[PDB]
C-alpha cells in the first residue's frame, strides 16, 4: 500500500498511518518528491517507531529512487519500503 507525503504533511499524522498499515499488512511504502517532503517522510517513519514499539514491533526501511508524476510531468522521487519486524 502506498502513502504519499508532501512538504506540508504532518509527521505525526503520517506516522499514525504508517503504524496502522504496519500493524495490519506488515509493510507499507512511503513516497516523497523534493527535500521538504522527503524530510517530513523521514520524521514520520522515525515517529512511527514510537507508535508500534508498544505492539512489540519495530521497522526497517530501504530507500530507492522511483519515477512518479507531479502535475503530469514525470519526476524522480524517493520511496521508502518499510517492513515490520517483531521484537519478541
Ligand atoms: Zn529487525
Resolution (A): 2.2
Eight-class DSSP state of 88: -
Q: Give the length of the chain.
A: 88
Decide: helix, strand or coil at residue 3.
strand
Q: Which CATH class is domain 1-88?
A: alpha beta
C-alpha cell at 7: 512538504
Q: Is 74 annotated as a binding residue?
A: yes
The C-alpha angle with vertex 10 and arms to 36 and 67, in degrees rounded to 5, equals 45
Distances (CA, A) of 44 to 40, 59, 71, 72, 74: 6, 12, 24, 26, 25
Closest C-alpha among 80, 82, 2, 75 to residue 49: 82
- Widest CA span of the chain, in angstroms? 45
> Residue 51 in contact with residue 15, Cβ under 8 Å?
yes
CA of 83 to the centre of ligand 1 (A): 9
Q: Where are the domains of the chain?
A: 1-88
Q: Is 85 annotated as a binding residue?
A: yes
Closest C-alpha among 14, 46, 16, 47 to residue 30: 14
Closest C-alpha among 60, 47, 53 to residue 87: 53
Way it was determined: X-ray
Amino acid at each position: 500500500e502506498t502513502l504519499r507525503v508532501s512538504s506540508k504533511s504532518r509527521p505525526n499524522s503520517v506516522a499514525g498511518a504508517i503504524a496502522a498499515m504496519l500493524r495490519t499488512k506488515g509493510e507499507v511504502e512511503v513516497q516523497a518528491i523534493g527535500p521538504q517532503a522527503v524530510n517530513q517522510a523521514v520524521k514520520a517513519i522515525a515517529i512511527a517507531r514510537g507508535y508500534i514499539a508498544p505492539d512489540n514491533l519495530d521497522l526497517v526501511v530501504k530507500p530507492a529512487f522511483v519515477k512518479l508524476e507531479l502535475e503530469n510531468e514525470e519526476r524522480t522521487a524517493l520511496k521508502f519500503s518499510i517492513k515490520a519486524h517483531p521484537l519478541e
